[PDB]
Design a binder for this molecule. Structure first.
Ligand SMILES: C[S@@+](CC[C@H](N)C(=O)[O-])C[C@H]1O[C@@H](n2cnc3c(N)ncnc32)[C@H](O)[C@@H]1O
Length: 224
């Protein structure tokens, strides 16, 4: 009775060829907000295409939210340069072929960058306004691995940055063609409304795309 000690999910997804998305986790633990965000990301890019890296060394499976485990989250306490040690199935993370999505970069990501990078890295950061520039910690941590690219001049949530990167790289849509809304207001009644100071991508109904559950969380907050 050893037959469950396997890596079938990995065998089933290979051989690797497709762009991957890596989130360097940079929050303590997993708040409800983070869980909803990461759940949405998993659903949009596919569990086989996401890695959550740099978790604290003491992290074990019980510390990972069951909602994320159920959606297939691949997670590791290794940093970017140790990911290949844990996940032997992934393509090598090659110097210069790993793109840091960096709000301060001087050059915006473009569809032709699909040819130029195999991995796209995001800070798992709940941003502040004004931004605290915490993404810069990644640039200093991996100075020869990463090349920075921008997603326009306003801050996006992690799931929005990944959604935008997928539209540019996978769907080959130029940034200037993506329909965004800057700093949307969410109003529910005369007593309850909240602005979110990020840039969001719009769905075909003209509404900002939020993780499932997030509008409920914003409504619960406004009701307090
Ligand atoms: C909410 S943001 C955090 C930004 C962080 N507060 C800062 O000022 O560096 C989450 C992640 O999505 C990516 N991101 C968000 N907005 C971006 C932009 N305008 N350009 C490039 N990457 C962006 C970055 O990888 C970032 O770490």
């Amino acid at each position: 009775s050893h037959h469950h000690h396997h890596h079938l999910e990995v065998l089933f997804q290979g051989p690797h060829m497709a762009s991957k998305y890596i989130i360097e986790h940079m929050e303590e633990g997993f708040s409800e907000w983070v869980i909803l965000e990461y759940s949405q990301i998993l659903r949009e890019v596919g569990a086989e295409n996401l890695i959550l890296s740099s978790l604290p060394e003491s992290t074990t499976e019980k510390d990972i939210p069951q909602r994320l485990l159920k959606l297939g989250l691949r997670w590791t306490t290794k940093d970017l340069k140790g990911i290949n040690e844990d996940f032997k199935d992934l393509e090598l993370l090659k110097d210069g072929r790993v793109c840091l999505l960096d709000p301060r970069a001087t050059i915006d990501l473009q569809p032709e960058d699909a040819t130029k990078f195999d991995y796209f890295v995001f800070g798992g950061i709940l941003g502040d306004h004004p931004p605290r520039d915490r993404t810069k910690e990644l640039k200093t941590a991996y100075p020869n691995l990463l090349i920075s690219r921008r997603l326009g001049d306003k801050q996006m949530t992690t799931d929005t940055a990944i959604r935008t990167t997928q539209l540019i790289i996978k769907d080959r849509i130029a940034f200037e063609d993506i329909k965004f809304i800057d700093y949307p207001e969410f109003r529910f009644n005369k007593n309850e409304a909240t602005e979110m100071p990020f840039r969001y991508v719009l769905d075909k109904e003209g509404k900002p795309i939020l993780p499932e559950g997030m509008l409920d969380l914003i409504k619960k907050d406004s009701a307090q």
